[PDB]
Amino acid sequence: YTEDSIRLYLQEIGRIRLLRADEEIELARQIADLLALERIRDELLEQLDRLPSDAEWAAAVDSPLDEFRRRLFRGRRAKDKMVQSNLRLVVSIAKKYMNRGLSFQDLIQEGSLGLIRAAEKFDHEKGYKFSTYATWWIRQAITRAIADQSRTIRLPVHLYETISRIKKTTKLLSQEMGRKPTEEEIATRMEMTIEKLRFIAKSAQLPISLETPISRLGDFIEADGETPEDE
Amino acid sequence: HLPDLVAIQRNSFRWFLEEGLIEELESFSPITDYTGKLELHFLGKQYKLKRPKYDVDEAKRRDGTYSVQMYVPTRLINKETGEIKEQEVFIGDLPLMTDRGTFIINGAERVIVNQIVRSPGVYYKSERDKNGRLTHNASLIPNRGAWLKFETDKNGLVWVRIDKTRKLSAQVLLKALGLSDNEIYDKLRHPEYYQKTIDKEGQFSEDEALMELYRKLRPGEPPTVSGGQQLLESRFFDPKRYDLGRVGRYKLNKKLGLNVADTVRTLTSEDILAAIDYLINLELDLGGCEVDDIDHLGNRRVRSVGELLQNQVRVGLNRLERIIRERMTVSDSDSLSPASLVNPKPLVAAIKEFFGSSQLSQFMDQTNPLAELTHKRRLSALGPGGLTRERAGFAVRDIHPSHYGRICPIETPEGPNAGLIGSLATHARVNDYGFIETPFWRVEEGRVRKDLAPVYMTADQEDDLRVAPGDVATDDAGYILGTTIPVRYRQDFTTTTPERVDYVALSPVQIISVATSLIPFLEHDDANRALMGSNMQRQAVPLLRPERPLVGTGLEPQAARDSGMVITSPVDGTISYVDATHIEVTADTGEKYGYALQKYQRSNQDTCLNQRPIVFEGDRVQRGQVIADGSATEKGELALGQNILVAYMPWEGYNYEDAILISERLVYDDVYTSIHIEKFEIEARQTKLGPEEITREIPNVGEDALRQLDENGIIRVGAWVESGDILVGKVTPKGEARDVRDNSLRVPNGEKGRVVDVRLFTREQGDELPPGANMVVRVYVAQKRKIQVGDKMAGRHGNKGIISRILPCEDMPYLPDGTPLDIVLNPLGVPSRMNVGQVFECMLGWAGQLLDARFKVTPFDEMYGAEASRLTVNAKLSEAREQTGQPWVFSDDEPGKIQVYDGRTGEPFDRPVTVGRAYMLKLVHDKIHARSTGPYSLVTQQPLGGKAQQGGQRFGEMEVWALEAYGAAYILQELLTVKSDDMQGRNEALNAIVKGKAIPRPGTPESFKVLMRELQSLCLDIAVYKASTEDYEEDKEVDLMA
Amino acid sequence: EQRFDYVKIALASPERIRQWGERTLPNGQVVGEVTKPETINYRTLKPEMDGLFCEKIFGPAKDWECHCGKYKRVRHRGIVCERCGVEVTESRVRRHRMGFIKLAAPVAHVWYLKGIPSYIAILLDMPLRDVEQIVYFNSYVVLNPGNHSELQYKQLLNEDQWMEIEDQIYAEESDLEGIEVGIGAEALQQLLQDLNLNEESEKLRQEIAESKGQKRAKLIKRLRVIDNFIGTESRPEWMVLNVIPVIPPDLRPMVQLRFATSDLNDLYRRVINRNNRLARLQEILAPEIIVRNEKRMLQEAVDALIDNGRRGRTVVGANNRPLKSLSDIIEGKQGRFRQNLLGKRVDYSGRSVIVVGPNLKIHQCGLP
DNA sequence: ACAGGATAAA
DNA sequence: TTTATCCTGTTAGATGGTT
Ligand SMILES: [Zn+2]
Secondary structure (H helix, E strand, C coil), X not given: CCCCHHHHHHHHXXXXXXXXXXXXXXXXXXXXXXXXXXXXXXXXXXXXXXXXXXXXXXXXCCCCHHHHHHHHHHHHHHHHHHHHCCHHHHHXXXXXXXXXXXXXXXXXXXXXXHHHHHHHCCCHHHXXXXXXXXXXXXXXXXXXHHHHHCCCCCCCHHHHHHHHHHHHHHHHHHHHHCCCCXXXXXXXHHCCCHHHHHXXXXXXXXXXXXXXXXXXXXXXXXXXCCCCCCC | CCCCCCCCCXXXXXXXXXXXXXXXXXXCCCEECCCCCEEEEECCCCCEEECCCCCHXXXXXXXXXXXXXXXXXXXXXXXXXXXXXXXXXXXXXXXXXXXXXXXXXXCEEEEECEEEEECCEEEEEEEECCCCCEEEEEEEECCECCCEEXXXXXXXXXXXXXXXXXXXXXXXXXXXXXXXXHHHHHHCCCHHHXXXXXXXXXXXXXXHHHHHHHHHHCCCCCCCHHHHHHHHHHHHHCCCCCECCHHHHHHHHHHHCCCCCCCXXXXXHHHHHHHHHHXXXXXXCCCCCCCCCCCCCCCEEEECHHHHHHHHHHHHHHHHHHHHHHHHHCCCCCCCCHHHHCCCHHHHHHHHHHHHHCCCEEECCCCCHHHHHHHCCEEECXXXXXXXXXXXXXXXXXXXXXXXXXXXXXXXXXXXXXXXXXXXXXXXXXXXXXXXXXXXXXXXXXXXXXXCCCEEEECCHHHCCCEECCCCCECCCCEECCCCEEEECCCCEEEXXXXXXXXXXXXXXXXXXXXXXXXXXXXXXXXXXXXXXXXXXXXXXXCCCCCCCCCCCCCHHHHCCCCCCCEEECCCCEEEEECCCEEEEXXXXXXXXXXXXXXXXXXXXXXXXXXXXXXXXXXXXXXXXXXXXXCCECCCCECCEEEEEEEECCCCCCXXXXXXXXXXXXXXXXXXXXXXXXXXXXXXXXXXXXXXXECCCCCCCCHHHCCCECCCCEECCCCEECCCXXXXXXXXXXXXXXXXXXXXXXXXXXXXXXXXXXXXXXXXXXXXXXXXXXXXXXXXXXXXXXXXXXXXXXXXXXXXXXEEEEECXXXXXXXXXXXXXXXXXXXXHCCCCCECCHHHHHHHHHHHHHCCCCCCCCCCCCCCCCCHHHXXXXXXXXXXXXXXXXXXXXCCCCCCEECCECCCCCCECCCCEEEEEEEEEEECCCCCEEECCCCECCCCCCECCCHHHCCCEEECHHHHHHHHHHXXXXXXXXXXXXXXXXXXXXXXXXXXXXXXXXXXXXXXXXXXXXXXXXXXXXXXXXXXXXXXXXXXXXXXXXXXXX | CCCCCEXXXXXXXXXXXXXXXXXXXXXXXXXXXXXXXXXXXXXXXXXXXXXXXXXXXXXXXXXXXXXCCCCECCCCCCEXXXXXXXXXXXXXXXXXXXXXXXXXXXXXXXXXXXXCCCHHHHHHCCCHHHHHHHXXXXXXXXXXXXXXXXXXXXXXXXXXXXXHHHHHHCCCCCCCCCCEXXXXXXXXXXXXXXXXXXXXXXXHHHHHHCCCCHHHHHHHHHHHHHHHHHHHCCCHHHHEEEEEECCCHHHCCEEECCEEECHHHXXXXXXXXXXXHHXXXXXXXXXXXXXXXXXXXXXXXXXXXXXXXXXXXXXXXXXXXXXXXXXXXXXXXXCXXXXXXXXXXXXXXXXXXXXXXXXXXXXCCCCC
């Protein structure tokens, strides 16, 4: 009866055995069948402007309602197992950003979405291991989540990319010239105005908390209003 | 025999530079990736250092950092191809320690305090139950890592409690370590006591031992022998997660009696077995075992900048190694070079955080050289790894008999910090393990051997010897006089024959600090007033013309040579050039030496750090002769106050309860006047509307208030600024030409002086401006302050006071020669405070004035006679009386008292009073504050607090209780609502007062509404209701927020 | 002569929380639900539209000025804009309006869960450890014994035990019907809805009559809590939160010095992020473990918001210091009551050093 | 992280 | 016109934490 939540999640994960490549291929085939069936249903939804009933959906596949429903179930369970047995991969990738703005548990749950998408777009016919395709999606989901959920004043992804390129250019100039580059040099190298560079530098800052010891910061800030004297 | 006073701060940085950084680089040098293909080696024995950029003075005036760059050679080795790309990588910027023991961080002088902590090792303790027997426990504490607690139960059981988890019998731990029964049976001395535990808990084998250890440490997981093994290896055996330290190994070997090498710094089987054996023997009372005292200075250590830096560097290096491994495995190609592999951001961040934002690196105390000197010799019990204010109790804040000669028993703060911050004694020093030592002379057959060299000794060493104090008197050569001699044996005071004395302290002032060593006639003062005087000596203010005491103590020339503000000639020659800013001395036969003097600089506490020359042009100068002096020194030695005529008698109520009555000569003779320099800052930022401009085109201002600006919007050097005067003119682009808005910087209310420096820093000039700023202007304003009503004056013996009246010199009492006094002090404050030493100094100072002499009396001077101080003072006064020729100077009927007359009427007082020359100091600190209406807080809409923002005075709940006891209801209600946070009643009250009408009734203050909103936000349906008047109606919920 | 007479405090129902936060617009659209964890725009420094500082929910940032700039000046009073639907009024309303957050899954109020008396545990007559395990998804609970023989109402089932029960119920020969289990705060809500207070009160009174010792004391405490709920006419399942209130933005100010932000903004953002992710997981039919872990995360985030560090680990900030939650504001020597209600900083006050005036009279003072 | 594509807001 | 902001996809293999 531990109180830790991450350890409990890791235990819940460890109760699942890793898949094998043949198991991956089988599950990928069932997942593809489920995806095609879902696409058909979506077509029925466009035709009916409503959710099709199981009987209408079974009729759309010329399949007995029992056979159709069992096929649907198998596909659901296949996708479920594919995601479930790879959560360990999700944790292995998510542990590499535990100090960037999102807590470890948030990284895990955001990488789970990438794993789900990877399991939805895996192609067995490609002839590759699922652990190679899934890594890209897990990493992308975690990086996007960090870009969109790490700051109180959220910055767009293009701003993160701009800041990264500014850092790389600054390091390259420092290595080339053997000294710290100036603002004008960096602005010329980046082909952008110095005011834009200063704006990027100002927007990259982290907001300081009101309760920073100085005694707290929040007790030294005046209030917006009209002074009784000025009325 | 006093060595360098600030040496605890140098030795620890010399050590860090010599062998402190190397050990931490080498401890992490071999970095390997997971595939085992690439390896980074850091040849940390060859780290070079780049010369500091800028300079010490340039860093100070630019508001930068004084530092160097560290470059270590590295070699990336490919495990297969074997290509080795040798290179030198940038590691970080290391701030450097100046010649005075301090660091310069962001253009401010900072000092790293010394921390007194508990030393690593094994400590035994015996606890007694309410009704049970004595049970013994042992704690094993490393320099860094997890603790290992052993405990003995009431039934004879041995338990181990790794970390703070539940206990586990020692058998599990000993079997998990890989020990068979025979070895743990042989090493233990009394094996049946442990055999009882073996029988009660069952003999675990290694496999099940590791299983149970894993089960107890990490419940909820399936046990695994390898899992347990790894857990133990990471807990107590991992060189990078458990460090005993050199001191930890030394203490373990000394206590347990082992012989393990000094190089091994992790726990070993021998260690735990020994510790258990010692616990068993202590339980059974073997004879050579003893519980430990944690307040003993032999079980406590001092950490200084070297150790704390090492630890921060270690953390940064761990982060750097993680980054390196991440940016090494990912690479699918060996296109990496050691320069592109290391990232100095974590190490730079760790060093910057340690030197700028830690609570062990402190803003320097720089009021005078004495405060500066005692700030570098300070020992703290608080910080990251020590105590906390709420956890420190009575036992920790007391004096321990092991502090004798190592920590001053007098100099401490008063208040919440009493006993938690201490000061190193005069002769004490810290050895290479971290324990405070103190020197002694050897005594052979009752003879003190001052020919041999002082033997230093730690607290534990001097427990079996009989040590005599430094006030024992010896005859010609060295033999100790007397028949009984006080000694210390095993932390107790006894008396012995002087043939059984082992060691003698070097000096009578070996027990006190440097600030307490500067109090003459100290043995005639109480300890509380000695504390007050020593503390207040470090709040004195450097004066316009300093002056040496007449009754100095002998340590003044030594307390000023370490602050690094006095210039002495190292050369026995002649002086060829003297100037207010430069001195030059030509060696008798040799090269010329040149010195530059600081002029009207500014300290951390806004005092002045001037430096003036003493010598004249074409002067013969010897080596070690004073050439220049600081702001608080006269000729070599400390000078914090002035010698003034004092009389002890009551005035017409102006001496009442520590108040001070002075003369007007102290104002027009420029006694007790000082220079204070303040710094004002203005920032040109970039708003979304536009940037901010510094210019003289200020709105709503006339040309009569732009006289002293330099046609750029900034005031001129040498201008006199009064209150509200513009210093830097700035305009902001407000959004609503007639668009600029005025937020120019002005002098605060109650401030005036001359402008002495206007430094400008802009990004164009190559300066490190803040992230969003485009111009930083700094203005320095200096002023001369005279003594005035409300200032604090002090003496060296603990007598403080506030000046309440300044009399014209024809109203002050005068002497039988016509000389009016300078200060009148109440004698009612002398006998109840037991600071009689002030009555001795005055009298000796009187003699010193009359004999044109200066007396150096050392504390505890009564080892030579029965009453040495009184006899010396009386003899000096009689000699002054005979030399001067005036019989009224000294009287035999009343030695220290002479006749004094009244300046108002000319009639003598009924009885003679005590007059003399007293050495008084002027203390720092700007406290007067008042407010009518100003800024308010964000959430509660209550007035802000603080002098710098027109803040209000807090009306706490004790004041509310006081007003409730008076029966006041309208004063209380006006204070609580109309004058604090009745957001609508404040304006109505102000408007009624201005117009002259009556103040209307208040409403509900805003803090109550904030609280109701917060309680609703906590999922509570709390509300305010108005009761129904008639019968068949429901109560109606009242809307406050309207 | 006085506006209000008494202050009454009761258990907040979800309807009351929604009423506190839901306000209608002239267009007919209702507002008051915070849907996005966004505080302010980085470039325009203007609050977002469905975030923690929204102007359509809390009020205009600038008094008598619209969010889009269509309406300005006092002339337009009470005129809700059409382009963005913000009410052109005084900005002071930003410290009175609340708004709410609707939760994808119910959570438990930590005050009624982790307290010296555990009201949820006392009402359910269950040990606190079992209730905590059910809430934080460590064990199942038998919401209905159904037809099984060894299963009892309100019994904790481990994962392996529940799998064995699943095998039993999916056997072709099983007559087992009507067995129900639950995990999370939804199970607690169902158990709290099951309680019939009148019958429980009568049964407890009858049992107390024939009882003594510690058993009597425990039944007395249960009867006291049950009778309090009967008198207050409040349903005990209200201790399980379905919606939560949002504090007004001016009570958690985000001022610009850099931007200084209250810790409540971060706590609310955590709650909103986890709630939105849970909704997405429930929309794509995610694996059950992932959904359960997200529900546990939502419970922990709401816990940290209400009282940080009471149950689980303490949520630190940018520096390793605890974030100040809602409970930390109203308690302690630095709390609201003792720092702002029982004692205040007042105007028309000064402070200075005192010297002795010997020529003054006892009723006089010397003021500079 | 990085590249391509769609779009609307400045 | 010209960016500012959002959306989707990526194929060696990788699969339970630090303080
Ligand atoms: Zn609008």
